[PDB]
Amino acid sequence: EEQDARVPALEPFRVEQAPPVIYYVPDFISKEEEEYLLRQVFNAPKPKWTQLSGRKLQNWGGLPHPRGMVPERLPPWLQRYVDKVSNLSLFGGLPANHVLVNQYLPGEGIMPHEDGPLYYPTVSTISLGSHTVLDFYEPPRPTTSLLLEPRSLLVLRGPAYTRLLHGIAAARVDALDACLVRGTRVSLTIRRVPRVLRAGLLLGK
Ligand code: NI
Numbered sequence: 735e736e737q738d739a740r741v742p743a744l745e746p747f748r749v750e751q752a753p754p755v756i757y758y759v760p761d762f763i764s765k766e767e768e769e770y771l772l773r774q775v776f777n778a779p780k781p782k783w784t785q786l787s788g789r790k791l792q793n794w795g796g797l798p799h800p801r802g803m804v805p806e807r808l809p810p811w812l813q814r815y816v817d818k819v820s821n822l823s824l825f826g827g828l829p830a831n832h833v834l835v836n837q838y839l840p841g842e843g844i845m846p847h848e849d850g851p852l853y854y855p856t857v858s859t860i861s862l863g864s865h866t867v868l869d870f871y872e873p874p875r876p877t878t879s880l881l882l883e884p885r886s887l888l889v890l891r892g893p894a895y896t897r898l899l900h901g902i903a904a905a906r907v908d909a910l911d912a913c914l915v916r917g918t919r920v921s922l923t924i925r926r927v928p929r930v931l932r933a934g935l936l937l938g939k
Pocket of ligand 1: 847848849900
C-alpha cells in the first residue's frame with residue numbers, strides 16, 4: 735500500500751513524520767492565482783452554494799453518488815488546477831474530474847472523517863485565504879497535526895486516505911508553541927470520481 739502510494743516527483747515534499755503517504759507543497763499557486771480563484775468562488779451564482787451546519791461548500795463537476803455521478807463540465811478557471819494536479823499523476827492514470835470547494839469562516843471546521851470509496855484514494859487540496867491546522871486520528875486526541883498555509887497543495891494517499899481520519903477543529907486561533915489568528919479559509923479539494931454516468935443518463939432512487 736505504502737510503496738504503491740509514493741509519487742517520486744513529490745519525494746522532496748514528503749511529510750516524513752506524518753503517516754504514509756502525505757505530501758505538502760508550499761507555494762503551489764502564486765498570490766495572483768490565489769486572488770483570481772477567490773474572486774471566481776465568491777462571484778459564483780448563489781445557488782452553487784450548499785449551506786451546512788459547520789461550513790458552506792460548492793460541488794463542481796457533478797454530485798458524487800454510489801449509483802454514478804451525473805457529470806457537469808468544469809469551468810476553465812478550475813480545469814487549469816485539475817490539469818496541474820492530474821499532471822502530478824495522483825489519480826491512478828486518469829485525470830481528476832471533481833472539485834469540492836469548502837468555505838470556513840473563523841471558528842468553523844469539519845469533524846474527523848475519511849473521504850471514503852466514492853473517490854480514487856487520493857485527496858489533493860489547494861488552500862486559499864487563511865492558514866488552518868489539519869488534525870489526523872487513528873480510526874481520542876490527534877496522533878499528528880499539520881499546519882496548512884495559504885497557496886499550499888496537500889496530498890493524502892495510501893493509509894493517510896484509506897485508514898486515517900482527518901478533521902479541522904472549530905477554532906479562531908492556532909497556537910504553534912507563536913499564535914496564528916484564523917481568517918476565512920477556502921479550500922479546493924480535487925479528486926477523481928470513478929463512477930460517472932454517460933451524458934444525458936439519469937438513475938432514479
Ligand atoms: Ni476530507
